[PDB]
Amino acid sequence: MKLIAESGSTKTEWSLVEGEHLIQRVFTEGLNPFFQTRREISRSIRLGLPDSFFKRKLEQVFFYGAGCTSAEKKSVVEASLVAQFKTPAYVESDLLAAARGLFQHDSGIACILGTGSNSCFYDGHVIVKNVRAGGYILGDEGSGAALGKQFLSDVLKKLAPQVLIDDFFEKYDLTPHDVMDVVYNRPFPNRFLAEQSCFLADYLRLDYVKGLLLSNLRSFFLRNVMQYDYLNYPIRFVGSVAYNYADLLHQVGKEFGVELSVVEETPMGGLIKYHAF
Amino acid sequence: MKLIAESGSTKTEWSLVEGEHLIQRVFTEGLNPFFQTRREISRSIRLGLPDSFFKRKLEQVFFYGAGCTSAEKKSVVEASLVAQFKTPAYVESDLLAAARGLFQHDSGIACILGTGSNSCFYDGHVIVKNVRAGGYILGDEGSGAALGKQFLSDVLKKLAPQVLIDDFFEKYDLTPHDVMDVVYNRPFPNRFLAEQSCFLADYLRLDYVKGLLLSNLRSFFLRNVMQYDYLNYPIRFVGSVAYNYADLLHQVGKEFGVELSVVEETPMGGLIKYHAF
């Protein structure tokens, strides 16, 4: 058996697999070596996974995660995995997870629309080019946080529909003042903004929300996708925003003259296939 | 004599005055009760002002500052002033400073374009209406930080002119990676973004920079100014961004059918007049 894990801001997905056969899947909290020390990662692993995961003969562990983006950060995660499982562990970024999960050994443009957003050209083996996403303030166009940022900007200006404003304040138990406090003074403001992506998804019948999604999705295409040779290679998407707003994403694709026929919630299914070759 | 002080992110201006006559002016660091305790404010005062300020018979002290926006925050500043000067001290916000400095006892729309941005309707006595600015992430349209945010977004995407990108990296001794670090991990990211407003001002001959200013100034008008009865009252501006980019601001005014003939660097001259009545 092998273990394949994919970690983002909201959770880690663990797949215990034999070849392409799923023995078990388990979710734990997100694990990010920029926010968590080696020991916290080890502890979160140790407390989150069932016993069967730790008693099982594993040939390798493939881990992909947000924040696994340098040699040093990959080491922290690797040390935890190696300590917890006593087996070869290979740590890569969430971006390479998207590329390999979406493309296998073919070439094309892989894009993530999740808490943040990301894109790359993948040559079937390595990432060859990677437009900088820029994070929740300076970029991450088309991401959950970008949506949340524009929505909350509109809430404070009273520009959004009253129904949405009232529902937002009630659901989150907030006032305008408390919004400022959360965004400017409390941990992980990006995650709170990105949570708005889930909130807004119930209100898609409103012109306001459709226009907000179209605007942010177009921005991702103009500022990220179209830096690549996007008319000459397949463009494939993964992530919670891409998945939940797949119809609007497809519409934006057609506006830019492309056919987006691959939109997946996560790269996990593709990663299981990839590590079976 | 009285003492009139106006405090923002970059500095405090102190005016020792008899009626409308300026005895002396001194600059110290900014003083903001959200970032500095009463004792730090007192110390910064005590170390920043000349002896003559402390030996002088003063009838009152009028202080206006960023962050002096609640009863409690005003108290902190007041306690410091009262301890340092042993005289009646009246603490108000930087917004009321703009209103009173720009309008005296007349009515109209007062706007600030500085590190952040702000606007209000002033009835000649009190602020009657105040669109929420929203801060550097969710709003502050037309501010230095909004400029810096779009510029740096463009820098990371490689969309800005190469000359600007090279000059930015060299002047600030930064790389793309170090930019992320400053914005996401270091204190007062708003102040660093707002500093870009001064950097860009030397490059106004570039189409890119003109278009950036026009876009951000238009945004301030669409999302803030035009929430007020802006065709029926004078609109007056104060602040470093408004002052440095006065020609483009005036142009944006005309686009929205208004004549902006009052643009001041600071409200200080107006405040001296106001507190002489």
Numbering used by the authors:
A (entry chain A), B (entry chain A): 2 to 278
Task: Quote the original article.
Unlike other bacteria, the pathogenic Tannerella forsythia, a member of the red complex group of bacteria associated with the late stages of periodontitis, lacks biosynthetic pathways for MurNAc production and therefore obtains MurNAc from the environment. Sugar kinases play a crucial role in the MurNAc recycling process, activating the sugar molecules by phosphorylation. MurK and K1058 are two sugar kinases of the cell wall recycling system of T. forsythia, sharing a sequence identity of 44% and separated by a single PGN-scavenging operon within the genome. Structural and sequence data showed that MurK and K1058 both belong to the group of ribonuclease H-like kinases and are members of the ASKHA (acetate and sugar kinase/hsc70/actin) superfamily.
Based on genomic sequence analysis, a second putative MurNAc kinase, termed K1058, was identified in T. forsythia, sharing a sequence similarity of 44% to MurK. We were able to obtain structures of the apo enzyme (K1058apo) and K1058 in complex with MurNAc (K1058/MurNAc). K1058 crystallized in a tetragonal space group (termed K1058apo) with a single protomer in the ASU. The biological corresponding dimer interface as is observed for MurKapo results from the application of the crystallographic two-fold axis. A superposition showed a close relationship between K1058 and MurK, with an observed Cα-RMSD value of 2.1 Å over the total protein length. Initial attempts of soaking MurNAc into MurKapo or K1058apo crystals with or without an ATP analog failed, probably due to an induced fit accompanying MurNAc binding.
